[PDB]
Design an enzyme around this catalytic site. Structure first.
Site, PDB file in Angstrom:
ATOM      1  N   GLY A   9       0.754  -1.216   0.000  1.00 39.05           N
ATOM      2  CA  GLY A   9       0.000   0.000   0.000  1.00 39.05           C
ATOM      3  C   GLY A   9       0.797   1.286   0.000  1.00 39.05           C
ATOM      4  CB  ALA A  10       4.111   2.229   0.997  1.00 45.26           C
ATOM      5  CE  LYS A  11       0.115   6.014  -3.677  1.00 40.62           C
ATOM      6  NZ  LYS A  11      -0.101   5.521  -2.288  1.00 40.62           N
ATOM      7  CG  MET A  12      10.148   2.363  -3.962  1.00 39.54           C
ATOM      8  SD  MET A  12      10.530   0.595  -3.869  1.00 39.54           S
ATOM      9  CE  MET A  12      12.303   0.616  -3.731  1.00 39.54           C
ATOM     10  N   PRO A  13       9.560   5.780  -4.657  1.00 43.73           N
ATOM     11  CG  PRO A  13      10.600   7.622  -3.692  1.00 43.73           C
ATOM     12  CD  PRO A  13      10.122   6.220  -3.379  1.00 43.73           C
ATOM     13  CG  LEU A  15      16.231   8.466 -10.087  1.00 34.32           C
ATOM     14  CD1 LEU A  15      17.247   7.370 -10.354  1.00 34.32           C
ATOM     15  CD2 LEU A  15      16.189   9.453 -11.255  1.00 34.32           C
ATOM     16  CG  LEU A  17      22.549   8.451  -4.279  1.00 28.85           C
ATOM     17  CD1 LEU A  17      23.056   9.018  -5.578  1.00 28.85           C
ATOM     18  CD2 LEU A  17      22.854   9.421  -3.134  1.00 28.85           C
ATOM     19  CG  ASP A  43      19.828   0.352  -2.495  1.00 30.07           C
ATOM     20  OD1 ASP A  43      18.827  -0.347  -2.244  1.00 30.07           O
ATOM     21  OD2 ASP A  43      20.977  -0.109  -2.621  1.00 30.07           O
ATOM     22  CE1 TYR A  48      25.986  -2.562  -0.676  1.00 28.39           C
ATOM     23  CE2 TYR A  48      24.644  -0.649  -0.703  1.00 28.39           C
ATOM     24  CZ  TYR A  48      24.883  -1.933  -1.135  1.00 28.39           C
ATOM     25  OH  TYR A  48      24.004  -2.531  -2.021  1.00 28.39           O
ATOM     26  CE  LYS A  77      20.326  -3.323  -1.201  1.00 31.56           C
ATOM     27  NZ  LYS A  77      21.334  -2.247  -0.981  1.00 31.56           N
ATOM     28  CG  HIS A 110      22.510  -7.487   0.522  1.00 32.48           C
ATOM     29  ND1 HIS A 110      23.195  -6.492   1.181  1.00 32.48           N
ATOM     30  CD2 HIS A 110      22.807  -7.348  -0.781  1.00 32.48           C
ATOM     31  CE1 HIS A 110      23.870  -5.794   0.293  1.00 32.48           C
ATOM     32  NE2 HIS A 110      23.671  -6.282  -0.926  1.00 32.48           N
TER      33      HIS A 110
END
Ligand SMILES: NC(=O)c1ccc[n+]([C@@H]2O[C@H](COP(=O)([O-])OP(=O)(O)OC[C@H]3O[C@@H](n4cnc5c(N)ncnc54)[C@H](OP(=O)(O)O)[C@@H]3O)[C@@H](O)[C@H]2O)c1
Ligand SMILES: NC(=O)[C@@H]1C[C@]2(NC(=O)NC2=O)c2cc(F)ccc2O1
Length: 315
Positions: A9-13, A15, A17, A43, A48, A77, A110
């Site tokens: 139910g959520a919105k994810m961009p 694009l 980085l 992301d 990392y 992740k 991951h």
């Protein structure tokens, strides 16, 4: 449109980085510039080794009221050495602390491969084989589901899962939350038609990583193909008066994918976001798809005997 609807139910961009290989002394400025020029999705990952610094940038921009927390979409992740039931909350909470967040918008497994827990991200045996964990991915998934029920994450997903592995989660007995996202390598040399169609057929959004072919991958060889230098892609870019990177980022957008190019270069961070002003034709899209050569940047080569290594399977 700038965002895609998830099965939570959520919105994810569409694009975001990328931050793999972004040096800790450059990534705070990289993320601050990114938010200033319109990125709303970052992301991240614990391995990392830069989440603290990413977090400093996010927190500054929230503090400065450049953006509201609800307008950001932050992804991280769970590393392979934390697939045990007992370790999943702590790993999530370490990431949250580092990022100076009280929730993640999306938390991904991951890789499907579990590794022996410990200080080492890649624990090795005498001959250099990765030491596996006997945890299986369905138990790891239940631990991820618990994170939603505790409010630490708004969505959960998977990464580097092949079709049979996505299937295994979808067919999990007692499945409570489907994966929202499968994040996989995808670009004109690894077009992923089969796996994308399977995931989208199931309501799972696919995120394309290394969309520029990761020219900074530590194992790059001169003989390897280079997307950014491929004259055929440069020709498409020149026809549209765009850069080759811009075509490489718009390509997955028009396949209904999310894409997460990495940069620490301010000018490139801004450039990479100016991809909402032009369209590739269907012919351009089919032409870019024809460049497939099943070439992977990220093949986890130390884990090829792991039982859950994902890339023996055709897809
Ligand atoms: N789930 C996983 O297993 C997984 C695996 C791999 C990647 N990822 C995620 O996906 C992200 C993107 O993948 P990636 O980092 O492998 O590589 P990528 O985004 O394909 O390529 C990044 C490289 O391209 C350069 N670059 C960026 N914009 C450019 C532009 N406009 N023109 C020319 N060069 C440009 C960057 O240079 P500068 O930085 O020097 O500007 C960097 O050297 C990662 O950072 C990570 O967040 C996830
Ligand atoms: N060998 C591989 O395929 C992966 C790729 C990968 N990059 C990434 O973003 N996720 C990964 O797991 C990565 C990142 C690291 F920080 C260290 C190792 C590493 O290995």
């Amino acid at each position: 449109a700038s965002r895609i609807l998830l099965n939570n139910g959520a919105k994810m961009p569409i694009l975001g980085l990328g931050t793999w290989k972004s040096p800790p002394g450059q990534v705070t400025e990289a993320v601050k510039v990114a938010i200033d020029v319109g990125y709303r999705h970052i992301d991240c990952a614990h391995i990392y080794q830069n989440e603290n610094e990413v977090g400093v940038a996010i927190q500054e921009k929230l503090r400065e009221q450049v953006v509201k927390r609800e307008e950001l979409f932050i992804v991280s992740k769970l590393w392979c050495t934390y697939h045990e039931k007992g370790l999943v909350k702590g790993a999530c909470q370490k990431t949250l602390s580092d990022l100076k967040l009280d929730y993640l918008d999306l938390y991904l497994i991951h890789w499907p491969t579990g590794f022996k827990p410990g200080k080492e991200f890649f624990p090795l045996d005498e001959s250099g084989n990765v030491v596996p964990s006997d945890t299986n991915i369905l138990d790891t998934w239940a631990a991820m589901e618990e994170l939603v029920d505790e409010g630490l994450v708004k969505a959960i997903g998977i990464s580097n899962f092949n079709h049979l592995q996505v299937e295994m989660i979808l067919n999990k007995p007692g499945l409570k939350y489907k994966p929202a996202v499968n994040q996989i390598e995808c670009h004109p040399y690894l077009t992923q038609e089969k796996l994308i169609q399977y995931c989208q057929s199931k309501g799972i959004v696919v995120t394309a990583y290394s969309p520029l072919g990761s020219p900074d991958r530590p194992w790059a060889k001169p003989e390897d193909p280079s997307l950014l230098e491929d004259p055929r892609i440069k020709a498409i870019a020149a026809k549209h008066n765009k850069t080759t990177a811009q075509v490489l980022i718009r390509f997955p957008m028009q396949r209904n994918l999310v894409v997460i190019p990495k940069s620490v270069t301010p000018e490139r961070i801004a450039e990479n976001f100016k991809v909402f002003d032009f369209e590739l034709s269907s012919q351009d899209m089919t032409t870019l798809l024809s460049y497939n050569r099943n070439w992977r940047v990220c093949a986890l080569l130390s884990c090829t005997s792991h039982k859950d290594y994902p890339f023996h399977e055709e897809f």
